[PDB]
Design a binder for this molecule. Structure first.
Ligand SMILES: C/C=C(C)/C=C/C=C(C)/C=C/C1=C(C)CCCC1(C)C
Length: 176
């Protein structure tokens, strides 16, 4: 039944950049292949006068050589024909941190409690996703109500990502 094609995934209706501004604590995540942020992830979103969205993010990353580093990351977003789908250019303040460009979609959000984000980095020949990442954010570091948890589980299912997220710890590693 349900369609796993990236192109059929619903997104946030009439997304509002200005209401999305602010601090968002990552609560759970579904990792992509390769190096990614491990934990202690906190993102901060901003929208200037011209409507240009940007964000800064802090998170712990395990370098291949076993060092643990706190990554200071920056991302700028470009608008598209869909208010909830953006192209994200990102880079770190330290030269060794990953740089790239990645789609950034806002699956769902109430602006005040939770948000579900999603990025497909590589499409299969059938249109499904072969390499994705998804974050579940909260406005409160204490998490969500059971009521909101139900909604979030729903969205995970529609991303065909159910049963594949892991809880993310916050223990002050990058100053929390
Ligand atoms: C080794 C360093 C690694 C992998 C860093 C990866 C950082 C990455 C995914 C950052 C993504 C985000 C940015 C910039 C802005 C806010 C939201 C996101 C979606 C949190």
């Amino acid at each position: 039944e349900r369609d796993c094609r990236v192109s059929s995934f619903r997104v946030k209706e009439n997304f509002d950049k200005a209401r999305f501004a602010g601090t968002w604590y990552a609560m759970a995540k579904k990792d992509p292949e390769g190096l990614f942020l491990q934990d202690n992830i906190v993102a901060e979103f901003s929208v200037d006068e011209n409507g240009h969205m940007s964000a800064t993010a802090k998170g712990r990353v395990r370098l291949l050589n076993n060092w643990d580093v706190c990554a200071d990351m920056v991302g700028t977003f470009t608008d598209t024909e869909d208010p909830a789908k953006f192209k994200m250019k990102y880079w770190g303040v330290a030269s060794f941190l990953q740089k790239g460009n990645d789609d950034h979609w806002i699956i769902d959000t109430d602006y005040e409690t939770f948000a579900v984000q999603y990025s497909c980095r590589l499409l299969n020949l059938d249109g499904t996703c072969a390499d994705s990442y998804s974050f579940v954010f909260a406005r409160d570091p204490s998490g969500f109500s059971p009521e909101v948890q139900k909604i979030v589980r729903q969205r995970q299912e529609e991303l065909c990502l159910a049963r594949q997220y892991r809880l993310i710890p916050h223990n002050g590693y990058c100053d929390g």
